[PDB]
Q: What sequence folds into this?
């Protein structure tokens, strides 16, 4: 619950929503919608996602 500055139409704040509130791996159809809010290219968006997951480490220990 980031409490500081209003950010509902933010470029990231939103991306973080469709990431968990919808799915960590959004499809083209989805990205298309973000293109507006984010104001980027359907391809520019993915870049944010692909990286998002990468940065976010998986849950649970790494055995094996």
A:
């Amino acid at each position: 619950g980031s409490s500081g500055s209003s950010g509902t139409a933010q470029p990231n704040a939103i991306l973080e929503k469709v990431f968990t509130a919808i799915t960590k791996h959004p499809d083209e159809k989805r990205l298309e919608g973000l293109s507006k809010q984010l104001d980027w290219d359907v391809r520019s968006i993915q870049r944010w996602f692909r990286q998002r997951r990468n940065q976010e480490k998986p849950s649970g220990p790494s055995s094996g």
Q: What stands out?
A: The CA atoms of residues 38 and 49 lie 13 Å apart. The chain has three helices and no strands. The domain at 6-59 is CATH 1.10.10.60 (Arc Repressor Mutant, subunit A).
